[PDB]
A paper describes a structure:
Carrageenans, alongside agars, are the main cell wall polysaccharides of red macroalgae and play vital roles in the development and physiology of these photosynthetic eukaryotes. In marine ecosystems carrageenans constitute a huge biomass and thus a precious carbon source for marine heterotrophic bacteria (MHB). The marine Bacteroidetes [name] DsijT, originally isolated from a healthy red macroalga, is a bacterial model for the bioconversion of algal polysaccharides. Here we describe in [name] the discovery and the integrative characterization of the complete pathway for utilization of the kappa family carrageenans (containing 3,6-anhydro-d-galactose units, mainly kappa-, iota- and beta-carrageenans), which is carried out by a complex regulon including a dedicated atypical PUL, lacking the susCD-like pair, and carrageenan-induced loner genes including distal susCD-like pairs.
The resulting 3,6-anhydro-d-galactonate is converted to 2-keto-3-deoxy-d-galactonate by ZGAL_3156, as measured through the thiobarbituric acid (TBA) assay. ZGAL_3156 did not demonstrate any activity on D-AnG alone and is thus a 3,6-anhydro-d-galactonate cycloisomerase (dauB). The crystal structure reveals an octamer, not uncommon in the enolase superfamily. A size-exclusion column analysis confirmed that ZGAL_3156 constitutes an octamer in solution. In the enolase superfamily, the active site is located at the interface of the two domains, the lid domain shielding the catalytic machinery from bulk solvent. Two disordered regions (17–26 and 138–143) were not modeled. They are close spatially and constitute the tip of the lid domain. The residues involved in the coordination of the catalytic cation (Asp194, Glu220, and Glu246) and the predicted general base (Lys166) and acid (His296) of AtGCI are strictly conserved between AtGCI and ZGAL_3156 and have similar spatial orientations. This cation was modeled as an Mg2+ in ZGAL_3156 and as a Ca2+ in AtGCI. The residues shaping the substrate-binding pocket in AtGCI originate from the TIM-barrel and the lid domain of one monomer and from the loop between helices α2 and α3 of the neighboring monomer.
Author numbering:
A (entry chain F), B (entry chain D), C (entry chain G), D (entry chain A): 1 to 16, 27 to 137, 144 to 315, 325 to 376
The structure:
């Protein structure tokens, strides 16, 4: 019932640069382990976990909030945003896998209840040129009901590509654009106003996460819904964002914002402020699982399903979840419903 | 004058628990070195420096802002506050020691000019009971014009001790109280109203750095000036602190908030908002030096002079600065005016 | 070295009225000189310099901020805006030429670092009628990527001319309109809404610099980005402009707003408020140089390149900077990289 | 009746440094002259008048607002505050002396009507130590009902002197304190709270004219009424001061803010905002006269009566006004009721 060993692992591989992820395993005196993930710079997150590890060993895993508050009280002064929050999120997601196992229930049921047993996720596909059209047509064939494309190659370059992908997918499939704060307010509305004709479901991270007044103005000047919050941490950060009427959709990453415990608190806030929540997910199947269980408990929904090459997701992590013809099905298995192939873990670790 | 090797060093020391601070040495192709420091969890900052090190090598040190913006562009999605900011701060302070050396001028002169050639710092002395009175009497005897005491032992316990220290130091010496966000709004005004009679120069971090409305209310309900910002990072963070009329004095830590480059930008903002700036300093002389040079360029001033038991500061780092009868004299030496005893560095290092 | 002699010179020439500009030369004990410029009424600025000259002689030029603060402390009650600010600006730009020379580095590197080694400036061309089309076609042929035209001849007269210039330059070249506060809110949106179809990059000084609510409303009712701040002085003035969400682009004139020192502080503020900065430039190459070095340090960019008939700029001032096919290249020479032909200086002057 | 010659004169005199003030004489084709004054740096104001002089010659003096608007249209881009406003003020006050003479009526009657035929001004007396007490006792003996003292020598030094002057003058005479923005918010309330016991009628310029939030806060934390606006220029400047609920009393200087025309417009605004107006006066009798006529038309009042050593005020300018036992009597003579001794003018002139 008590924590015996927290074990952070930095997993990597280069494809065509490198993908460096930090992954934890918290195991109890009884052998009951739990899998969690942190989002950001792998090796920095890994040291973060090491920082909290002394104050978590021999303490009870069911009262996960008592541990979250200990980690918070310890890092408050040196955290707020960034790295130590990804360290707290990584431990949290594992304590929710433990609890799920421990109380023999999935995480969604343990968060309050499965509100959506089926989810329809969107396919993410970032960038010659005609290859993007093929990647999109693959997703439509793969049953997907929506797809998220990466923009930031230039206002006139993007509008040329957005036109091409919309022509391929037709009008029935949903399409979203993601800048990655690669544009400024003037550059964002120029793209927004011009891309409106292609029925864009939303615009993800259009300006700097620091440009709150820019987000609000963009929302006022375009019909396309405004997404943001990848870079937003804790209940306090998202309150600050919602008080500014910035986004139509809040996108906290479970692995970054403060884990399942805090993204649930952010979900309460989103609700009160009457703002939609679609979490951000860009890691292994441990990361994806936490989102599966969160959107199930959220009140057909969508979630981020990275279709990009990644053997740290497909090979290192083992999911029980089922996806056929754009629809994903929430698992009933205790905890997140994930494991790590310890041979593929050792093969893909870092030096 | 390109960067050839960035070298982060975690140095440990237990007295009566442990004091673990991270430090950097950036050395150019020409063997010009510069010393820097990060504030927060040593081993986490140390990995942070390692994160930016690949994109800093083979780049010119004089154009320090080009490097700051590269580090920012790289961490803007996974930082905003905490750990990666103290990694950016640490590199910055060392690039200012390099520039100082390189152009054969002190940092203050290189920040714009020595406005205050003499500064009068305050003595910090945290916690049987009668020992606190002796530590204070020592500081008054040592020439100090002001002293900062730590509070959070209970409203009635603090008021008992604040009365004792004021009785010892008399009326001529300034005295400040520091909660360390160990109090809530109701607990803070209870102490503030009760401690008003013992002439308190300021109340440092009275409530949570997240409780902006609490700071503002406390400022409205007490005569004692309100200090805060230890836990505030970047120009964007201090703009939101100032927009909410929270503090009378803003206290950014150079080694945490974004280095000398950003604390200077925070100084421009503080100026525009007509709010005083006294930086936070709690490290080695690499950290103290950066503050010496910053308050010199700021427009008799004070700064944080840690007077606690610290061999890591007093032994590993070598300062040139002179202090006699409460007054500190800004050095004219190129750069920060600091060096590291490489034998005491090897002796005090962490495994 | 210390300041031995500040020398203001009012220079003029009538072409087809007169252009009366004031310039300064600050000369050190060691004969190190620095060239500066003030923007506004020459003879009034010239007396301004004379006002500060007594309190600047025998003082050190490297600690330029110590001098800026002396000039400020002296003229704060009788300044805030206008004439004495252009007096402080003129001295500042020359102390930055001195420092550049003194420390053997260009101004941009000395402001923090060259962020943009290449800039693409815009051609200014103010006003029968068919002559304007030829002036524009000349700029397009001269490789310019953008051109700024003067408007204020009447809503229907301007829309007639804007149509003509856009027809000549085609769709690939950028085009901006400048009212010179010659329009009121009702007259401004009438032009804005009608001129949109001609792809206008921005609208410069659309209403009175005093009509902040007019600027905000115009921004809300038109797609064309709103420029302004020519007439704005100091960090306090620009804070006041940004607090009211007036402009998309802030245009401080280095030679008017408070020199390189203050336009840099305005640049920190613009950054915090997430508003673009394109400085205003309308003088000699002393003025153009200061902007070259400022936009280089700012984070392809543009700047104001006056392409009208002016011999005080082309004959009295000597530049090192290179311009070939719309692109300008930041110089590496110590200081601004400018000199004054003292024979042409004596030739163009005032009794 | 057109303007034939505008003549600015810079008059200098050293006592125990120099007092350099600029004065104007506008004379019509018919030999009707009018005397004016500008407040600030004499030689800078003198060049300002020279700037507008070309666009004022051969134009009618009764339609003074047509001239004010011409000067404004010309200066707005390079003025807003300071020097060019004091040039516009100087011309304005002389056009009001002309109009007064021209229509054979005093200025107060020509501003709308004498509301107060008798006004009780205050004696200004800035700074061994015991000499201040004697200067105050002289004023009480001279009949004065109120006196304004200069503060900024240090919080404990001022409280020592304020106590001394109050002891001498007794309880019946009013007493006001003037910082001259020599204090910051923390330093201002320290002085305000401590000086409350000495019945202070008002606190003039307590913080920087730029620290609007400081003024507002000080007003909230002290019982002593807050004065300010010396450094405020135009109707636009005073609207922004009043919008922020800064002052209890607005103090525009006629010779600086925009002359009698603008201080009257500022008076309309002050009225609408329900804020008192006591103008700032620190020049010759040309300046004092303009205030006599303005407070007469304002709706027993007070005004600034400089009682220091001033040979330019008492020798160069000739007044008709009468003062006996603290009460001043508004003159009925056409215009301001002032002349200049042309021999003492030629004597005190500058090179
Ligand atoms: Mg995204
Ligand atoms: Mg502290
Ligand atoms: Mg313009």
């Amino acid at each position: 019932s008590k924590i015996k060993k927290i074990e952070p692992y930095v997993i990597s591989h280069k494809l065509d640069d490198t993908r460096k992820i930090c992954i934890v395993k918290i195991t109890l005196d009884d052998g009951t382990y739990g899998w969690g993930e942190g989002y950001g710079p792998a090796a920095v997150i890994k040291s973060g976990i090491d920082f909290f590890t002394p104050f978590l060993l021999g303490k009870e895993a069911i009262g996960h909030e008592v541990l979250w508050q200990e980690m918070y009280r310890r890092s408050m002064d040196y955290a707020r945003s960034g790295v130590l929050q990804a360290a707290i999120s990584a431990i949290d997601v594992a304590l929710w896998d433990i609890k799920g196992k421990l109380l023999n229930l999935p995480v969604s049921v343990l968060l309050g209840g499965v509100k959506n047993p089926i989810i329809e996720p969107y396919a993410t596909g970032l960038y010659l040129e005609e290859l993007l059209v093929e990647e999109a047509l693959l997703y439509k064939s793969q049953g997907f009901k929506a797809t998220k494309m990466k923009v930031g190659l230039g206002i006139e370059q993007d509008l040329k590509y957005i036109a091409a992908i919309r022509k391929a997918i037709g009008p029935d499939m949903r399409l979203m654009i993601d800048s990655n704060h690669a544009y400024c307010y003037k550059e964002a509305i120029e793209l927004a106003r011009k891309a409106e004709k292609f029925d864009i479901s939303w615009f993800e991270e259009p300006v700097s996460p620091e440009d709150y007044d820019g987000y609000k103005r963009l929302r006022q000047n375009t019909t396309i819904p405004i997404s943001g919050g990848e870079c937003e941490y804790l209940k306090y950060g998202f309150k600050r964002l919602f008080d500014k009427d910035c986004v139509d959709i809040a996108q906290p990453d479970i692995c970054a914002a403060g884990g399942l415990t805090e993204v649930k608190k952010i979900a309460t806030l989103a609700q009160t402020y009457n703002v939609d929540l679609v979490p951000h997910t860009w890691g292994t199947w441990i990361a994806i699982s936490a989102a599966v269980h969160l959107v199930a408990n959220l009140d057909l929904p969508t979630m981020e399903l990275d279709r990009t090459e990644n053997a740290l997701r497909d090979e290192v992590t083992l999911h029980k979840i089922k996806l056929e013809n754009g629809h994903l099905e929430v698992p009933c298995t205790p905890g997140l419903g994930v494991d790590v192939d310890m041979d593929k873990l050792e093969h893909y670790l870092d030096k």
